[PDB]
Amino acid sequence: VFNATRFASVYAWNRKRISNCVADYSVLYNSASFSTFKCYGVSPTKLN
Amino acid sequence: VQLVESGGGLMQAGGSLRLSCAVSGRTFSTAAMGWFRQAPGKEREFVAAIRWSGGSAYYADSVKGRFTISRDKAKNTVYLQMNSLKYEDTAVYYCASYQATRSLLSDYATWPYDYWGQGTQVTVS
Amino acid sequence: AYTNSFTRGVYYPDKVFRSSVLHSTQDLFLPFFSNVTWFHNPVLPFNDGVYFASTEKSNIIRGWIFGTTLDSKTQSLLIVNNATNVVIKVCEFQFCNDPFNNCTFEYVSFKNLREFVFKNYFKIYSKHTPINDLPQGFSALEPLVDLPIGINITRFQTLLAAYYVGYLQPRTFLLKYNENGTITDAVDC
Amino acid sequence: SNNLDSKVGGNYNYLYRLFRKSNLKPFERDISTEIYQAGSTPCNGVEGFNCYFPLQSYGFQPTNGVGYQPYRVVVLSFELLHAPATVCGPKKSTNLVKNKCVNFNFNGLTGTGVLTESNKKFLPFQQFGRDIADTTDAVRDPQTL
Ligand SMILES: *[C@@H]1O[C@H](CO)[C@@H](O[C@@H]2O[C@H](CO)[C@@H](O)[C@H](O)[C@H]2NC(C)=O)[C@H](O)[C@H]1NC(C)=O
Ligand SMILES: *[C@@H]1O[C@H](CO)[C@@H](O[C@@H]2O[C@H](CO)[C@@H](O)[C@H](O)[C@H]2NC(C)=O)[C@H](O)[C@H]1NC(C)=O
Ligand SMILES: *[C@@H]1O[C@H](CO)[C@@H](O[C@@H]2O[C@H](CO)[C@@H](O)[C@H](O)[C@H]2NC(C)=O)[C@H](O)[C@H]1NC(C)=O
Ligand SMILES: *[C@@H]1O[C@H](CO)[C@@H](O)[C@H](O)[C@H]1NC(C)=O
Ligand SMILES: *[C@@H]1O[C@H](CO)[C@@H](O)[C@H](O)[C@H]1NC(C)=O
Ligand SMILES: *[C@@H]1O[C@H](CO)[C@@H](O)[C@H](O)[C@H]1NC(C)=O
């Protein structure tokens, strides 16, 4: 998803479903490559 | 609050110039001040903000590594040290006041502020 | 310097009268047969509670200071007894290095053994007894003052002959009340 | 208190703590402004990435939803302890009767019994006494020692 070559237009935003896997959020919330990593009603750390 | 800017003027590319801005009134310790600029025919653009307590600084990408913002608490004055001036720095510079305290420092880049200074012109030849 | 705190530092933990009964109670007491630091001025911690004692001939020791920093910028407690009255204040005092604004509370009221207990608001128990270093035996401390001040305290010092400091701990005690409601013996559980 | 605590443009004088390393204990008051370390890098009092200011302002505008409108709150805690009780209701006192079965109330301590002159040697501080059963056995009249 993040290293995908091409993205969709906002009007036709793509939806990828994630299921039956282990979600390693550390790689994301500890990385410095994202300018906005905003989460509402949940904390990234708690996600684990 | 009343905001009064100074320090604008004519400078050669490569030089350095310090703008000043005096804050009076409800000088909240948990608020922030930001500097923004407007070039002719362009919209006003946020440059940098600093929190009064602690002095942590936030910079726009357009100015990161060149400009420094500082404040002297005792004097209730905030300073923007504008180093390595470039033609693209040409604009009217305004210092603005926030009365809203935000946990996320980056929000001061986009937050709509309460009060604005009058602006001081910097022109780079 | 150290001495043995044989059986001293027992105070009535509550305001209830009890006669000819053994009552078990949990509170901050001085553990029996513990080490009490012996001084004959310095600044001392205030871990959870303090047992102070003084053997006096000329009443040199007069008062106590309590608090966190023991200079201004914080609410600190000061207690001073001068011959005829007692003074208590919780002002943000500027204390001296060797002592001897915003006052939010104020109250005004060897052979001599004077025993005090300071604990946390603020409770002061005390007892005066004649004696023949730290005496072996048993005597209970009646409450004297209850200050509802709520001052955060973690350190203290004395304002002036030797004194002793012990530290209270949360220990369960069995107390023997006689016919007259006086505590006459105790057991450290 | 929307009429008072809200203003056009947003009133931000009222703050709340938004991050904390642990939940508060009952009636704990924390006023510290240390930069919250959300990530692994120590902040050293400097805000930035994973280094946030622990406080945030409230947005109290008159046009805000009732859920977001300002409300003034008072919390009364009552100290039902074993000490002399100094905060009482307006309830008037009455005369005392001895040697009769009566429904008595001393400072909120209620019961039914026969009140007699006692010979117990209460100490100047001792407020009321108890029996082996931890039941009230003797009292001090609030008006008379
Ligand atoms: C009461 O005051 C003391 C002393 O001012 C406080 O103790 C501090 O605690 C923190 C965290 O453990 C330490 O980093 C400091 O070094 C302590 N102070 C000193 C002078 O050593 C304590 O937090 C205060 N408690 C309350 C409830 O206010
Ligand atoms: C002990 O010290 C206190 C305070 O320094 C003295 O109490 C004062 O007494 C005078 C006498 O009228 C009063 O006007 C003051 O209001 C009192 N102030 C306080 C804080 O108590 C007392 O005189 C001293 N006793 C001595 C020296 O024997
Ligand atoms: C409890 O108190 C009573 C009196 O308040 C004590 O009895 C008195 O003891 C003194 C001590 O010498 C005598 O002078 C009196 O003659 C006693 N009075 C009576 C009426 O006996 C009593 O001893 C105390 N309890 C204990 C265990 O000693
Ligand atoms: C008290 O101190 C002495 C000397 O340091 C020591 O020998 C003794 O064991 C101590 N007693 C205690 C810790 O109960
Ligand atoms: C005493 O109270 C005033 C009023 O808020 C305050 O300005 C001052 O800081 C206080 N004194 C100290 C030592 O903090
Ligand atoms: C009020 O109570 C005190 C208690 O010490 C007593 O001295 C006084 O006589 C009482 N007065 C009235 C009017 O009840």
XYZ file of C-alpha atoms and ligand atoms in Angstrom:
633
model
C 0.000 0.000 0.000
C 2.577 2.577 1.078
C 5.259 1.678 -1.490
C 2.663 1.375 -4.280
C 3.875 2.936 -7.530
C 0.595 4.663 -8.435
C -2.226 6.089 -6.318
C -5.884 6.733 -7.112
C -7.570 10.087 -7.586
C -9.370 11.423 -4.519
C -12.762 11.108 -6.223
C -12.037 7.457 -7.102
C -9.989 6.516 -4.044
C -8.892 2.889 -4.031
C -9.903 0.611 -1.170
C -7.658 -2.274 -0.137
C -8.966 -4.680 2.497
C -6.544 -6.045 5.097
C -7.475 -9.235 6.935
C -5.954 -12.379 8.438
C -2.481 -10.987 9.088
C -0.348 -9.365 11.784
C -0.284 -5.571 11.524
C 3.154 -4.222 12.464
C 2.347 -0.600 13.214
C 5.809 0.152 14.644
C 7.375 0.285 11.159
C 4.886 3.082 10.481
C 4.590 5.196 13.619
C 8.338 5.094 14.336
C 9.310 5.951 10.752
C 10.214 9.554 9.940
C 9.067 9.398 6.300
C 5.487 10.527 6.998
C 4.537 14.133 7.626
C 0.997 13.390 8.823
C 0.234 10.252 10.845
C -3.003 11.356 12.448
C -5.223 8.942 14.373
C -8.616 9.740 15.917
C -10.103 7.950 18.909
C -7.111 5.591 19.009
C -3.365 5.824 19.680
C -0.876 4.110 17.333
C 0.970 2.552 20.274
C -2.235 0.956 21.601
C -2.934 -0.697 18.231
C -0.483 -3.522 18.999
C -2.991 42.163 21.738
C -0.997 44.729 19.749
C 1.700 43.473 17.379
C 4.370 45.851 16.053
C 6.926 44.597 13.531
C 10.327 46.035 12.703
C 13.518 45.155 10.862
C 12.381 45.135 7.244
C 14.434 46.688 4.498
C 16.645 46.165 1.474
C 19.256 43.405 1.571
C 21.494 41.648 -0.934
C 21.107 37.926 -1.603
C 23.330 35.916 0.725
C 23.024 38.429 3.559
C 21.130 38.032 6.812
C 18.429 40.141 8.468
C 16.525 39.990 11.772
C 12.854 40.971 12.014
C 11.374 41.774 15.421
C 7.841 41.690 16.830
C 6.716 42.889 20.265
C 3.810 41.136 22.013
C 1.736 42.838 24.710
C -1.534 42.046 26.486
C -2.573 38.503 27.364
C 0.864 36.978 26.856
C -0.144 33.342 27.302
C 2.742 31.079 28.242
C 1.089 28.072 26.583
C 0.308 29.817 23.293
C 2.464 30.409 20.218
C 3.484 33.105 17.798
C 3.939 32.558 14.093
C 5.433 34.482 11.225
C 3.743 34.496 7.822
C 4.528 36.220 4.526
C 2.611 37.451 1.478
C 4.332 38.026 -1.859
C 2.739 40.320 -4.472
C -0.095 38.507 -6.214
C 0.301 35.459 -3.945
C -1.578 34.309 -0.867
C -0.252 34.850 2.647
C 1.990 31.928 3.628
C 3.010 30.558 7.038
C 6.763 30.559 7.749
C 7.577 29.553 11.336
C 6.113 29.360 14.832
C 7.577 29.112 18.336
C 5.871 28.252 21.626
C 6.416 30.821 24.383
C 6.985 28.187 27.072
C 9.957 25.987 26.239
C 10.842 27.628 22.951
C 10.236 24.634 20.705
C 10.175 25.740 17.082
C 8.262 24.732 13.960
C 9.297 25.739 10.449
C 7.686 25.690 7.029
C 9.518 23.509 4.520
C 10.163 26.609 2.383
C 12.346 28.165 5.104
C 13.739 25.172 7.031
C 17.505 25.411 7.431
C 17.673 29.107 6.485
C 15.466 31.007 8.960
C 15.581 30.920 12.764
C 12.799 32.069 15.092
C 13.599 33.109 18.669
C 11.861 34.971 21.476
C 13.017 36.942 24.511
C 10.519 36.330 27.331
C 11.748 39.137 29.604
C 11.228 41.665 26.795
C 8.014 40.058 25.433
C 9.539 40.184 21.960
C 9.790 37.466 19.320
C 12.539 37.448 16.697
C 12.831 35.815 13.284
C 16.457 35.490 12.156
C 16.255 35.372 8.354
C 19.581 33.949 7.193
C 20.688 33.173 3.630
C 18.127 35.542 2.144
C 16.921 34.661 -1.352
C 14.763 36.462 -3.902
C 11.928 34.088 -2.988
C 12.030 35.556 0.526
C 10.714 38.818 -0.966
C 7.316 39.401 0.660
C 5.545 41.425 3.312
C 6.240 39.648 6.591
C 3.619 39.522 9.334
C 3.902 38.270 12.896
C 0.664 36.782 14.217
C -0.620 35.718 17.634
C -2.363 32.487 18.642
C -4.489 32.301 21.775
C -5.242 28.600 21.230
C -2.958 26.030 22.867
C -2.367 22.956 20.708
C -0.747 19.689 21.746
C 0.476 19.038 18.190
C 3.056 21.695 17.322
C 2.520 21.264 13.572
C -1.040 22.569 13.931
C 0.300 26.116 14.273
C 1.284 26.001 10.596
C -2.378 25.773 9.583
C -4.341 27.010 12.618
C -6.306 30.203 11.925
C -4.892 32.778 14.318
C -6.619 35.492 16.325
C -4.521 38.645 15.758
C -2.078 39.752 13.055
C 0.671 42.351 12.898
C 0.812 45.078 10.279
C 3.669 43.638 8.210
C 7.171 44.808 7.348
C 8.534 44.773 3.793
C 11.696 42.860 2.905
C 12.937 43.326 -0.674
C 15.917 41.347 -1.988
C 17.810 42.856 -4.915
C 25.024 8.286 65.801
C 22.367 5.690 66.621
C 20.410 4.516 69.649
C 17.702 1.926 70.268
C 14.057 3.042 70.080
C 12.940 0.422 72.584
C 9.177 0.808 72.876
C 8.660 4.535 72.236
C 6.652 6.243 69.526
C 3.123 4.980 70.232
C 0.260 7.439 69.807
C -3.502 7.120 69.851
C -4.273 6.389 66.181
C -7.884 7.553 66.455
C -10.159 9.665 68.595
C -12.106 6.737 70.092
C -12.111 5.992 73.812
C -11.452 2.357 74.721
C -10.981 0.824 78.153
C -9.723 -2.574 79.304
C -9.344 -3.892 75.764
C -6.698 -4.878 73.207
C -7.298 -3.131 69.891
C -5.445 -3.959 66.680
C -4.731 -0.979 64.449
C -2.830 -0.238 61.262
C -1.188 3.173 61.018
C 2.229 4.812 60.779
C 4.136 3.930 63.938
C 7.770 3.820 64.971
C 8.938 0.199 64.559
C 9.982 -1.198 67.907
C 13.705 -1.568 68.605
C 14.729 0.379 65.504
C 17.634 2.752 64.888
C 16.921 6.420 65.579
C 19.513 8.896 64.357
C 21.060 10.849 67.224
C 22.280 14.436 66.894
C 23.817 16.808 69.395
C 20.883 21.551 62.935
C 21.225 19.415 59.766
C 18.466 18.923 57.229
C 16.599 15.617 57.462
C 14.185 13.782 55.124
C 10.512 13.340 55.978
C 9.981 9.929 54.397
C 6.426 9.239 55.631
C 6.467 10.518 59.196
C 8.874 11.567 61.887
C 9.425 10.673 65.515
C 11.273 13.532 67.185
C 12.613 13.457 70.732
C 14.552 15.968 72.810
C 16.406 15.737 76.114
C 16.546 19.296 77.427
C 17.908 21.321 80.347
C 17.483 24.910 79.099
C 14.853 24.477 76.342
C 17.214 25.230 73.460
C 15.159 23.510 70.759
C 12.124 25.571 69.916
C 10.536 24.768 66.571
C 10.432 22.868 63.307
C 10.335 23.650 59.592
C 8.773 21.283 57.065
C 8.454 21.177 53.314
C 10.132 20.245 50.042
C 12.750 22.914 49.241
C 12.747 25.045 52.418
C 13.146 28.281 50.518
C 10.559 30.517 48.848
C 8.665 29.521 45.648
C 6.802 26.757 47.466
C 4.425 26.348 50.358
C 6.448 25.384 53.415
C 5.366 24.884 57.019
C 7.000 26.703 59.930
C 6.389 25.965 63.620
C 7.859 28.075 66.438
C 7.134 28.063 70.166
C 8.510 31.101 72.029
C 8.070 30.831 75.793
C 4.477 32.079 75.937
C 2.832 31.370 72.581
C 3.189 29.014 69.632
C 3.188 30.199 66.020
C 2.407 28.120 62.929
C 2.467 29.425 59.366
C 2.660 27.954 55.883
C 4.068 30.978 54.073
C 6.568 30.584 51.233
C 9.429 31.527 53.523
C 12.967 32.504 52.596
C 14.837 30.519 55.225
C 18.415 31.088 56.340
C 21.202 28.590 55.744
C 21.383 27.928 59.513
C 18.040 29.295 60.720
C 17.047 29.695 64.360
C 4.510 35.882 51.381
C 1.239 34.114 50.527
C 0.519 32.778 54.015
C -2.397 30.420 53.334
C -2.817 29.287 56.959
C -1.782 30.569 60.366
C -2.500 29.270 63.851
C -1.428 30.497 67.284
C -1.937 28.685 70.573
C 18.781 16.022 81.233
C 15.367 15.754 82.915
C 12.847 16.836 80.257
C 11.951 14.277 77.588
C 9.786 15.716 74.796
C 8.450 13.292 72.194
C 6.624 14.363 69.037
C 5.151 12.625 66.012
C 4.624 14.426 62.708
C 2.680 12.636 60.001
C 0.426 13.175 57.030
C -2.989 17.045 56.050
C -0.924 17.501 59.211
C -1.160 15.707 62.566
C 1.033 16.421 65.599
C 1.105 14.157 68.636
C 3.318 14.807 71.619
C 4.062 13.775 75.173
C 6.114 15.297 77.979
C 7.654 13.061 80.645
C 10.227 13.331 83.420
C 13.186 10.964 83.123
C 16.332 10.081 85.089
C 20.379 7.988 75.948
C 16.832 7.405 74.722
C 14.865 6.063 77.710
C 13.656 2.490 77.711
C 10.035 2.148 78.739
C 6.578 2.917 77.432
C 4.379 6.001 77.205
C 1.727 7.110 74.728
C 1.489 10.394 72.843
C -1.781 12.315 72.965
C -2.653 14.447 69.927
C -2.004 18.158 70.372
C -2.696 19.862 67.045
C -4.506 18.975 63.828
C -3.605 21.293 60.949
C -5.738 20.921 57.791
C -3.077 22.547 55.641
C -2.333 20.031 52.884
C 1.266 21.180 52.432
C 3.358 18.737 50.419
C 6.279 17.830 52.700
C 9.313 15.643 51.985
C 12.030 17.252 54.131
C 12.349 19.103 57.415
C 14.756 20.780 59.823
C 14.868 21.918 63.448
C 15.181 25.445 64.876
C 16.961 25.898 68.191
C 21.300 19.790 73.915
C 20.537 16.797 71.697
C 17.604 15.500 69.679
C 16.697 12.231 67.951
C 14.827 11.409 64.748
C 12.944 8.243 63.892
C 10.851 7.412 60.854
C 7.347 5.986 60.981
C 6.330 3.015 58.864
C 2.994 1.365 58.037
C 3.044 -1.331 60.730
C 0.171 -3.152 62.420
C 0.047 -2.746 66.201
C -1.849 -4.279 69.082
C -2.554 -1.739 71.820
C -3.476 -2.418 75.446
C -5.916 0.159 76.816
C -6.257 0.066 80.613
C -9.395 0.893 82.641
C -8.794 4.629 82.149
C -8.358 4.410 78.404
C -4.620 4.956 78.608
C -2.399 2.924 76.316
C -0.064 1.054 78.636
C 1.596 -1.582 76.442
C 1.784 -2.392 72.756
C 2.877 -5.150 70.388
C 4.495 -4.571 67.002
C 2.885 -7.259 64.862
C -22.020 28.260 30.866
C -21.964 28.742 27.079
C -23.084 32.392 27.387
C -20.100 33.241 29.603
C -17.311 30.840 28.671
C -17.825 30.972 24.886
C -16.957 33.788 22.495
C -17.037 34.560 18.777
C -13.849 33.124 17.312
C -13.326 30.532 20.046
C -12.398 30.969 23.701
C -9.153 29.121 24.447
C -8.398 30.177 28.038
C -9.632 26.828 29.388
C -7.214 23.926 28.924
C -7.164 20.170 29.426
C -4.377 17.618 29.642
C -4.405 15.458 26.518
C -1.513 13.025 27.098
C -0.100 11.383 30.205
C 2.145 8.411 30.919
C -0.406 6.876 33.301
C -3.921 7.414 34.556
C -4.385 9.792 37.459
C -5.020 8.657 40.992
C -8.184 9.979 42.674
C -7.935 13.720 43.389
C -4.452 13.992 41.884
C -3.475 17.373 40.424
C -0.817 17.475 37.699
C 0.271 20.866 36.368
C 3.580 19.843 34.766
C 4.309 20.797 31.152
C 7.082 18.289 30.386
C 7.154 17.255 26.735
C 5.430 13.892 26.334
C 7.716 11.306 24.703
C 5.362 9.470 22.355
C 8.205 7.551 20.697
C 11.632 6.215 21.644
C 13.622 9.451 21.314
C 13.957 11.505 24.522
C 12.521 14.980 24.012
C 14.533 16.902 26.644
C 11.782 19.499 26.841
C 11.819 20.068 23.071
C 8.648 19.569 21.033
C 8.672 17.900 17.629
C 8.209 14.469 16.098
C 6.769 12.205 18.820
C 7.347 15.124 21.216
C 4.074 16.901 21.945
C 2.877 19.482 24.423
C 0.721 17.691 27.020
C -1.971 20.392 27.116
C -4.502 21.631 24.577
C -7.099 24.400 24.616
C -10.849 23.920 24.532
C -12.781 25.371 21.639
C -15.710 27.095 23.357
C -17.744 28.989 20.785
C -21.398 30.014 21.255
C -22.254 28.120 18.050
C -20.699 24.819 19.167
C -22.810 21.732 19.687
C -24.199 21.249 23.193
C -21.754 18.368 23.576
C -18.957 20.896 23.010
C -20.482 23.845 24.885
C -18.766 24.839 28.162
C -20.149 23.530 31.459
C -19.136 24.653 34.956
C -18.744 21.711 37.347
C -18.461 21.610 41.144
C -17.584 18.356 42.923
C -18.315 18.139 46.648
C -16.435 15.473 48.586
C -17.541 14.786 52.142
C -15.161 13.713 54.884
C -17.061 11.122 56.861
C -14.146 10.452 59.239
C -13.698 9.788 62.944
C -12.905 13.334 63.964
C -14.991 16.185 65.349
C -17.321 17.230 62.569
C -17.450 20.890 61.624
C -19.593 20.991 58.467
C -23.189 20.399 59.499
C -26.599 20.949 58.014
C -28.984 23.702 59.066
C -30.939 21.239 61.246
C -31.545 22.890 64.615
C -30.524 21.282 67.888
C -32.834 20.537 70.812
C -32.603 19.956 74.542
C -31.042 16.813 75.981
C -32.971 14.174 77.939
C -31.320 11.684 80.296
C -32.533 8.382 81.757
C -35.164 7.821 79.068
C -35.311 5.648 75.987
C -34.772 8.246 73.251
C -33.886 8.567 69.578
C -30.681 10.612 69.738
C -28.585 12.339 67.061
C -25.136 13.696 68.007
C -23.428 15.257 64.962
C -25.051 12.757 62.624
C -24.311 9.803 64.898
C -27.807 8.377 65.228
C -29.119 5.716 67.545
C -31.671 4.749 70.142
C -30.782 4.343 73.787
C -30.802 5.676 77.328
C -28.364 8.526 77.968
C -26.843 8.671 81.449
C -24.100 10.634 83.150
C -20.923 8.641 82.537
C -17.819 8.175 84.672
C -15.429 7.361 81.822
C -12.152 9.290 81.870
C -12.252 10.661 78.353
C -9.147 12.565 77.314
C -9.454 16.246 76.277
C -9.301 15.135 72.636
C -11.364 11.949 72.691
C -14.694 12.523 70.986
C -16.719 9.387 71.611
C -16.038 5.922 72.936
C -16.552 2.362 71.767
C -17.218 -1.073 73.231
C -15.605 -4.424 72.483
C -18.146 -4.857 69.667
C -16.964 -1.672 67.888
C -20.344 -0.102 68.677
C -20.834 3.384 70.060
C -20.912 3.182 73.847
C -20.375 6.777 75.024
C -20.481 10.200 73.394
C -19.423 13.775 74.010
C -22.240 16.284 73.703
C -21.327 18.636 70.824
C -22.554 21.629 72.832
C -21.174 20.587 76.253
C -17.914 18.808 77.059
C 6.307 17.143 46.811
O 7.538 17.786 46.692
C 8.624 16.909 46.378
C 9.881 17.742 46.428
O 9.680 19.016 45.831
C 8.406 16.240 45.024
O 9.403 15.238 44.849
C 9.941 15.286 43.511
O 9.567 14.102 42.787
C 10.064 13.979 41.449
C 9.532 12.672 40.907
O 9.817 11.594 41.787
C 11.584 14.064 41.418
O 12.031 14.089 40.067
C 12.105 15.282 42.168
O 13.523 15.228 42.281
C 11.477 15.416 43.559
N 11.886 16.662 44.188
C 13.065 16.813 44.804
C 13.328 18.162 45.403
O 13.882 15.901 44.873
C 7.012 15.628 44.906
O 6.726 15.311 43.548
C 5.909 16.542 45.461
N 4.647 15.827 45.556
C 3.463 16.415 45.365
C 2.259 15.532 45.500
O 3.367 17.609 45.093
C 6.283 35.104 70.265
O 6.328 35.499 68.949
C 5.074 35.976 68.448
C 5.317 36.386 67.015
O 6.618 36.933 66.845
C 4.494 37.112 69.305
O 3.093 37.196 69.067
C 2.717 38.555 68.766
O 2.319 39.254 69.956
C 1.848 40.600 69.797
C 1.458 41.092 71.172
O 0.300 41.915 71.120
C 0.707 40.689 68.789
O 0.428 42.056 68.504
C 1.001 39.940 67.498
O -0.182 39.844 66.713
C 1.561 38.538 67.750
N 1.959 37.917 66.497
C 2.051 36.594 66.328
C 2.461 36.134 64.960
O 1.823 35.805 67.240
C 4.754 37.001 70.809
O 4.729 38.295 71.400
C 6.079 36.312 71.144
N 6.137 35.962 72.554
C 7.188 36.242 73.333
C 8.336 36.940 72.664
O 7.214 35.943 74.524
C -7.485 5.297 86.790
O -7.772 6.565 87.437
C -8.097 6.483 88.833
C -8.401 7.896 89.275
O -8.628 8.745 88.159
C -6.933 5.829 89.573
O -7.233 5.698 90.958
C -6.506 6.679 91.746
O -5.090 6.467 91.744
C -4.368 7.480 92.457
C -2.899 7.178 92.277
O -2.194 7.261 93.507
C -4.795 7.515 93.923
O -4.179 8.630 94.558
C -6.310 7.602 94.082
O -6.683 7.399 95.440
C -7.035 6.599 93.182
N -8.474 6.803 93.230
C -9.343 5.796 93.365
C -10.793 6.177 93.397
O -8.976 4.630 93.460
C -6.683 4.448 88.990
O -5.614 3.819 89.690
C -6.336 4.587 87.514
N -6.096 3.281 86.921
C -5.033 2.520 87.203
C -4.959 1.206 86.488
O -4.172 2.873 88.003
C 21.574 0.037 63.931
O 22.908 0.522 63.577
C 24.012 -0.258 64.057
C 25.271 0.437 63.592
O 25.162 0.852 62.237
C 23.893 -1.684 63.545
O 24.966 -2.465 64.059
C 22.561 -2.297 63.947
O 22.437 -3.609 63.410
C 21.398 -1.426 63.475
N 20.130 -1.966 63.937
C 19.098 -2.214 63.124
C 19.314 -1.909 61.673
O 18.037 -2.666 63.542
C 1.838 34.647 45.688
O 0.623 34.864 44.983
C 0.723 35.695 43.822
C -0.676 35.828 43.264
O -0.967 34.789 42.340
C 1.708 35.115 42.815
O 1.934 36.080 41.794
C 3.036 34.705 43.441
O 3.762 33.884 42.533
C 2.865 33.964 44.774
N 4.145 33.814 45.448
C 5.010 32.836 45.162
C 6.279 32.827 45.958
O 4.781 31.999 44.297
C -22.005 27.310 72.460
O -21.093 26.249 72.695
C -20.022 26.560 73.595
C -19.151 25.328 73.677
O -17.920 25.600 74.333
C -20.562 27.005 74.954
O -19.484 27.477 75.754
C -21.630 28.085 74.820
O -22.272 28.303 76.071
C -22.675 27.715 73.769
N -23.607 28.812 73.561
C -24.877 28.631 73.182
C -25.698 29.875 73.009
O -25.344 27.513 72.987
